[PDB]
Amino acid sequence: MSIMKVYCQICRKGDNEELLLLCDGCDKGCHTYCHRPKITTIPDGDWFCPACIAKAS
Ligand SMILES: NCC(=O)Nc1ccc(N)cc1
Ligand SMILES: [Zn+2]
Ligand SMILES: [Zn+2]
């Protein structure tokens, strides 16, 4: 067995799933409202977290 429950890297809670961005690079989560700067566009498709982009850049 293996269990994955997603938690937001910042506040460390899995609530508000609708505002919880799962990064498709590294599978990590972050609430839009926990982000600095805050996200006000709930992404239309795929999310790459800030850390992943600076690697991919
Ligand atoms: N991995 C992309 C992602 O997380 N997209 C997403 C889309 C809609 C909502 N409400 C939340 C998250
Ligand atoms: Zn959070
Ligand atoms: Zn990532």
Written overview of the protein:
The chain is largely without helices or strands. The protein has a single domain (1-57), classed as Zinc/RING finger domain, C3HC4 (zinc finger) (Herpes Virus-1), CATH 3.30.40.10. 12% of the residues lie in helices and 11% in strands. It is built from one helix and two strands, in the order ββα. The protein has one helix at 50-56, and strands spanning 20-22, 29-31. The chain has a two-stranded antiparallel sheet. Strand 1 and strand 2 (29-31) form a beta hairpin. The protein is globular and about 35 Å long.
Strand order of the largest sheet: 1-2
> How many helices does DSSP assign?
1
Strand content: 5-15%
CATH architecture: 2-Layer Sandwich
Zinc finger (PHD-type): 5-55
Protein name: Bromodomain adjacent to zinc finger domain protein 2B
Subcellular location: Nucleus
Family: Belongs to the WAL family.
What's a concise summary of this model?
The protein is mostly loops. It has 1 helix and 2 strands. The chain is globular and about 35 Å long.
Question: Can you lay out the helices and strands and say which pair or pack?
Answer:
Layout: E1 20-22, E2 29-31, H1 50-56
The structure holds ~{N}-(4-aminophenyl)-2-azanyl-ethanamide and zinc ion (2 copies).
